[PDB]
Design a protein around this ligand. Structure first.
Ligand code: CL
Ligand code: CL
Length: 162
């Protein structure tokens, strides 16, 4: 297992524009297109991302390319964030993938706001972070996925994904 496989499991893969769990237009492997409620707007952003007139539909290769860019962007985000980088740097490889998962889903900003949880992960108080991580809208809205990522931080193994 790795970060790519991990996210592919959590996000799925859809080749036509669809709405995510929040009702926002997305395509591929969890690539958010826009928070706007306009399909046209989403189509415009899709064509801009791909470089062609897609008519709201992409190929598998194209989805994977977006996915690679998004993963990449998520790591750099972390590395560039003052709150995140130290945590990330203190963790083992497995747990780092869980932190990337969160940032891909919620953005750097939203994750950087889990202050208490961040501090517990940094301190290696696994069970404690896991309880504090569950006290969140994230957990209440997407409990199964949140469960898998939390288990990941708690155990440092890929057990939740196997
Ligand atoms: Cl893009
Ligand atoms: Cl879920």
């Amino acid at each position: 297992m790795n970060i790519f496989e991990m996210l592919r499991i959590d996000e799925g893969l859809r080749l036509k524009i669809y709405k995510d769990t929040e009702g926002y237009y997305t395509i591929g492997i969890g690539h958010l297109l826009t928070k706007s409620p306009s399909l046209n707007a989403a189509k415009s952003e899709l064509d801009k991302a791909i470089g062609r007139n897609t008519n709201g539909v992409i190929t598998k290769d194209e989805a994977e390319k977006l996915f690679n860019q998004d993963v990449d962007a998520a790591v750099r985000g972390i590395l560039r964030n003052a709150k995140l980088k130290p945590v990330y740097d203190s963790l083992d490889a497995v747990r780092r993938a869980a932190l990337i998962n969160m940032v891909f889903q919620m953005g750097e900003t939203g994750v950087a706001g889990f202050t208490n949880s961040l501090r517990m992960l940094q301190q290696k108080r696994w069970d404690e972070a896991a309880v504090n991580l569950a006290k969140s809208r994230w957990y209440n809205q997407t409990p199964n996925r949140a469960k898998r990522v939390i288990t990941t931080f708690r155990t440092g193994t890929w057990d939740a994904y196997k």
